[PDB]
Amino acid sequence: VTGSGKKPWRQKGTGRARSGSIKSPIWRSGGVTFAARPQDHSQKVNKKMYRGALKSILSELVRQDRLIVVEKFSVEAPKTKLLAQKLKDMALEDVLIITGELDENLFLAARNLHKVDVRDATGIDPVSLIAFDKVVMTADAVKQVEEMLA
Amino acid sequence: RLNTLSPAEGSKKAGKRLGRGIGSGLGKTGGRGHKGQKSRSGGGVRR
Amino acid sequence: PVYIPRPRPPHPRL
Amino acid sequence: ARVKRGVIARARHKKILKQAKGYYGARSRVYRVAFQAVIKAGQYAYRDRRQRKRQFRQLWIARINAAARQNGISYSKFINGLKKASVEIDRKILADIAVFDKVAFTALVEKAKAALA
Amino acid sequence: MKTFTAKPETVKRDWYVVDATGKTLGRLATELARRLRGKHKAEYTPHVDTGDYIIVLNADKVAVTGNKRTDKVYYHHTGHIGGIKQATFEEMIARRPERVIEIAVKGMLPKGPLGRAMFRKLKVYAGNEHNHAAQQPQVLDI
Amino acid sequence: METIAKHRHARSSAQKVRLVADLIRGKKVSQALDILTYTNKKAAVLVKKVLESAIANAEHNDGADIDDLKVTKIFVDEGPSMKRIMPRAKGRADRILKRTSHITVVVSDR
Amino acid sequence: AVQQNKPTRSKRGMRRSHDALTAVTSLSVDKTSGEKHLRHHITADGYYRGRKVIAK
Amino acid sequence: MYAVFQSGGKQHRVSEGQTVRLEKLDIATGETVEFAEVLMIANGEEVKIGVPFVDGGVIKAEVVAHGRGEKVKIVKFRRRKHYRKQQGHRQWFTDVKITGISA
RNA sequence: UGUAACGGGGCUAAACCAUGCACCGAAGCUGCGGCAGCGACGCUUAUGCGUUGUUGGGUAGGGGAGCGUUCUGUAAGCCUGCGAAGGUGUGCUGUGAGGCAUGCUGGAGGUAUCAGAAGUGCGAAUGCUGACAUAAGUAACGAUAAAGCGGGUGAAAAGCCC
RNA sequence: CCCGGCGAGGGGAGUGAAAAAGAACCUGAAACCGUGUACGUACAAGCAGUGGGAGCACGCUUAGGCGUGUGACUGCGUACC
Ligand SMILES: [Mg+2]
Ligand SMILES: [Mg+2]
Ligand SMILES: [Mg+2]
Ligand SMILES: [Mg+2]
Ligand SMILES: [Mg+2]
Ligand SMILES: [Mg+2]
Ligand SMILES: [Mg+2]
Ligand SMILES: [Mg+2]
Ligand SMILES: [Mg+2]
Ligand SMILES: [Mg+2]
Ligand SMILES: [Mg+2]
Ligand SMILES: [Mg+2]
Ligand SMILES: [Mg+2]
Ligand SMILES: [Mg+2]
Ligand SMILES: [Mg+2]
Ligand SMILES: [Mg+2]
Ligand SMILES: [Mg+2]
Ligand SMILES: [Mg+2]
Ligand SMILES: [Mg+2]
Ligand SMILES: [Mg+2]
Ligand SMILES: [Mg+2]
Ligand SMILES: [Mg+2]
Ligand SMILES: [Mg+2]
Ligand SMILES: [Mg+2]
Ligand SMILES: [Mg+2]
Ligand SMILES: [Mg+2]
Ligand SMILES: [Mg+2]
Ligand SMILES: [Mg+2]
Ligand SMILES: [Mg+2]
Ligand SMILES: [Mg+2]
Ligand SMILES: [Mg+2]
Ligand SMILES: [Mg+2]
Ligand SMILES: [Mg+2]
Ligand SMILES: [Mg+2]
Ligand SMILES: [Mg+2]
Ligand SMILES: [Mg+2]
Ligand SMILES: [Mg+2]
Ligand SMILES: [Mg+2]
Ligand SMILES: [Mg+2]
């Protein structure tokens, strides 16, 4: 606290409590008793536990039919209109598209649908897998991800 | 589902907060006995 | 306010 | 993650004052002093729920004693004649009879007398 | 169901006259206190004076046992510091015999507005005549 | 109609004015005015200048009939007490409070 | 030389019970002017018993 | 004509046609129950008492409704000893209605 | 200080002794209801504990279980200008932390659930800050060099002007 | 516009959705100070409550009483850390 360190009043004589510095956490405009440091909250989850988490999330996506597997699936013009119409055809609304490789057209088409995210077969993650309504995995991505999980 | 994952029982022991009332067990010297040295701010003999 | 005087010499109860 | 604890403290102090409604002076306007009164009122309630079971037995007994000395037998010999005749009426019913139905209590007294005879 | 309670307005209070001649002061005033407080009534309720007014006659002729006649002292302090004025039994009987009974019954009545409202219903009289005949007190042999 | 006339931030204590205000209550204005005119106080001046108002705001807004006009409800409330500082012996300072009072008069035909 | 508890609103009011003001019982209309004036005080116009005793 | 009968060890005195408030009885909220333990029958003037019981005594009641009583608040407390405890209680009660009384 | 060495009245039994019978007398025990824990054949299915027996005063303290507030995700979801938070009443409900529904004020935000983090819960620290009490309409109005009157102006003159 | 001192402050009128949004300006709590109503209180003793409880006032149901407000009188009761 930008201040001084002088006893605001002597130790005796005063009728008020024994105080030491205008900065004390008690006082108004004083310091916080335990000021939070800028910390890190990254916690280590074992490689094996992360793999064993994905190998369970995917099995349950299968069991819950939220995993729609397809062959090649992209577009020809980077038109979010085109991709949205394509999803209308697929009768879906909120989908994580795990393609084999980021197809710049598909990526640019999905950039602007806040219910659709296109990820390569490697940048997948549990939070997204679970959160998104349905995940569509091109068979390329299926093979890639199963070999990644090993 | 995101709002359905719940940890297995006994995982989170739910912490222990000292000096937060009379109902909670601790509080008013928070499980560190009455006055003394082992009950001071930072007190406690060396190893 | 900002200044506090010393109290009177207390009872010399020696 | 600062939490301005300005609603819980308020709606708790108020919850105490609402219980303190009806107390004299600042004892019902100030939370630092209504709190003592409310815990003291709790002690008094928890203790009077037994002092009442005492007082009402010692009132029923007084009424039965009245209406028994009326009919010529002390409370002791009355209860004794009752228990001997194995009549299990309790002091509350005895007192209320002795107040409302005088001839019923007179019949009770006569039965107790006969049992002691 | 709630037990009965005598109501202040609904209750009736009889009268009684008692002849203190030769009666022992205690065993007179004691029964007087019982009656005044209302124990003799089955309609008793300890927060309402269900007792019957009592008129004491021959209050001079009350008697005490043993040598109490000249040794039972009645003290009272006059508020002022040194004045603890005492008065023996004979001096009390000679000055004003009402106070003998009145004290013996204030001592046995409850202490509190109910007590000082029960003691309002005792009408001790020194001699043998009482002008309360208009209320028709029944004779009482205690 | 209950005509209201107030006086907020009146430079006078909230007690010295209640002393006067409690004189005139439920009284015909024809009598309350006399009382205040021959009351020896300073709050008498305030309450009289306010009662004049209330009567005028009755006769020029709510109709007429200064004849039948009782001071239905009159009350004096604490107001913003101006702080000031006064020095005492040995350097001590004591915060004195210049008091203020919201006078309220409510006169009605009744 | 100083209090030792605070006298409540009860005392702060009862002690003021007698601090109430004394409303003047009644004025007295002048003899001939018809104006109001305190007894034995001259009327606001300088009349007293109906005599222009002031002319001011 | 009233009857003295005990249900929860607390003997009530009830006339035919009025309600009571018992300790809960395992009876559906609209069923008819009886008490075959009458302790005394006013029977107008000639009261029947019975040594342990009025032998022929039978009271017929209709259970009006169950319920939970007023919320009492227990507050245990020891001054200066850092100990208090709050607790509620609502005793179950079975409002019945004395339909019939038989000596 | 004021009896003052029965608690008081008072008592010659209303004292002491001995015998016996009654009765009052606790939150003890019993009676009916309710909860919680522990233990024992169950039900084999993480049990309705179907049943029991038993335990349940508790400070320092150990253990178990929770309520609640802020923020994040679930949530571009849901609620909401046909009234959100907040404030204030009322009723119901839970064993408690508490919740719910709703009246009025408010006039635009809130957030279910299941998890996650805490600046997570105040009555005290001669605590800090702001506000308002009390003493109180009381002391005091600051040199005991001194004021009085007429006229003026002014809404009001003891204090301003003459 | 009216009261007002060619004031302060206010009541009307008017904008405004709202002026108990009027610049002392969103909500507007609590302490604290009033005004009105209901009940109690001027022969009564004490951690100021609780248990009981009459009376009185009021809302509903009718007339079964109940709920609310007070609480006369009485048993017990010497705050908190
Ligand atoms: Mg800071
Ligand atoms: Mg790594
Ligand atoms: Mg504490
Ligand atoms: Mg420890
Ligand atoms: Mg300590
Ligand atoms: Mg030690
Ligand atoms: Mg230690
Ligand atoms: Mg914040
Ligand atoms: Mg008992
Ligand atoms: Mg006593
Ligand atoms: Mg100086
Ligand atoms: Mg002291
Ligand atoms: Mg005065
Ligand atoms: Mg002496
Ligand atoms: Mg027990
Ligand atoms: Mg038991
Ligand atoms: Mg036990
Ligand atoms: Mg325990
Ligand atoms: Mg402990
Ligand atoms: Mg919030
Ligand atoms: Mg408003
Ligand atoms: Mg904190
Ligand atoms: Mg605080
Ligand atoms: Mg001050
Ligand atoms: Mg004052
Ligand atoms: Mg003084
Ligand atoms: Mg003086
Ligand atoms: Mg002076
Ligand atoms: Mg001077
Ligand atoms: Mg002059
Ligand atoms: Mg001068
Ligand atoms: Mg103006
Ligand atoms: Mg706004
Ligand atoms: Mg505001
Ligand atoms: Mg307020
Ligand atoms: Mg009176
Ligand atoms: Mg007297
Ligand atoms: Mg007193
Ligand atoms: Mg009481």
DSSP string, A54-115: HHHHHHHHHHTT-EEEES----SS--HHHHHHHHHHTT-SSEEEEESS--HHHHHHHTT-TT
Distance CA A34, CA B41 (A): 14
Q: How far apart are CA H48 and CA H50, in angstroms?
A: 6
Distance in angstroms (rounded) separating the CA atoms of residues D106 and D112: 10
Rounded to whole angstroms, the Cα distance separating G37 from D49 reads 70
The tally of CA atoms less than 13 A away on the side-chain side of residue F76 is 25
Instruction: Look at the alpha carbons of F35, F38, F44, F50 in this order and tell me if their dihedral is positive or negative.
Output: positive
Q: Which residue of C has its CA nearest to A8?
A: C2
Residue A104 CA to residue A100 CA, distance in Å, equals 12
Is any atom of strand I within 7 angstroms of residue H79's beta carbon?
A: no
Tokens 């109902």 found at: B23
First to last CA, chain D: 86
CA–CA distances in Å: residue D63 to residues E3, F22, F103, H11: 11, 54, 62, 18
Instruction: Identify the DSSP state of H48.
Output: B
Please state whether beta strands H83-89 and H72-78 pair in parallel, antiparallel, or not at all (unpaired). Answer: antiparallel
Q: How many domains does chain G have?
A: 1
E52/chain D closest Cα distance in angstroms:
14
Strand J at less than 7 A from CB of E1? no
d(CA B34, CA A125): 52
**E50-86 exposure pattern, b = at least 16 Cβ within 10 A, e = fewer:** bbbbbbbbbbbbbebeeeeeeeeeeeeeeeeeeeeee
Single-letter amino acid, residue A2 = T
Is residue D117's beta carbon less than 7 angstroms from any atom in nucleic acid strand I?
no
Domains identified in chain A, total number: 1
For chain H, the first-to-last Cα distance in angstroms comes to: 10
Which domain, by its residues, includes G3?
1-55
Distance in angstroms (rounded) separating the CA atoms of residues E45 and E37: 9
Q: Does an H or E element contain H89, and which?
A: strand H83-89
- The helix or strand, by DSSP H or E, that contains position D68, with its residue range, turns out to be helix D31-70
E strands present in chain F: 3-10, 70-78, 82-87, 93-98, 101-108
Contacts (Cβ under 8 Å, ≥6 apart) of H97 = H17, H18, H19, H20, H61, H62, H63, H64
Phi, psi of E11 (to 5 degrees): -70, 150
Interatomic CA–C1' length for residue F13 and nucleotide I148, angstroms: 34
Give the Å distances, CA to CA, from B27 to B23, B41, H27, H75: 8, 15, 48, 20
Question: What is d(CA G49, CA D65) in angstroms, rounded to the nearest whole number?
Answer: 83
Whether the beta carbon of D114 falls within 7 A of nucleic chain J: the reply is no
Cα–Cα distance list, E131 to A36, D109, E35, E95 (Å): 94, 40, 21, 22
Rounded distance between C-alpha atoms, residue F74 and residue E22, angstroms? 71
What angle do helix axes F43-60 and F29-37 make, rounded to 10 degrees? 150
- Alpha carbon distance E51, F9 (integer Å): 63
Q: Which sequence spans correspond to the domains of chain H?
A: 1-103
Beta-bridged to residue H68, according to DSSP, are: H92
Separation in Å: I21 C1' and A112 CA: 103
SS3 D113: helix
Q: Quick one: CA torsion of B34, B38, B42, B43, rounded to 10 degrees?
A: 120
The answer to whether the CB of H59 falls within 8 A of the CB of H38 is yes
- What number of CA atoms fall less than 13 Å from residue A29's CA on the CB side? 5
At A133, which CATH number? 3.40.1370.10
Structural domain for A56, as ranges: 1-149
Nearest Cα neighbor of A73 from A49, A50, A90 is A90
Q: How far is the CA of D14 from the C1' of I83 (A)?
A: 26
Q: Do F22 and G20 touch (CB under 8 A)?
A: yes
Of 1.20.1630.10, 3.90.470.10, 1.10.3720.10, 3.30.470.10, the CATH number of F1-110 is 3.90.470.10
Query: Residue A68 CA to chain centroid, in angstroms?
Result: 23
Binding residue per annotation — F6? no
Amino acid at G38: L
Residue D23 backbone class (left: φ over 0; alpha: ψ -120 to 50; beta: rest): beta
Distance of CA D24 from the midpoint of ligand 35 (Å) = 19
| Ligand located closest to F15 CA | 25
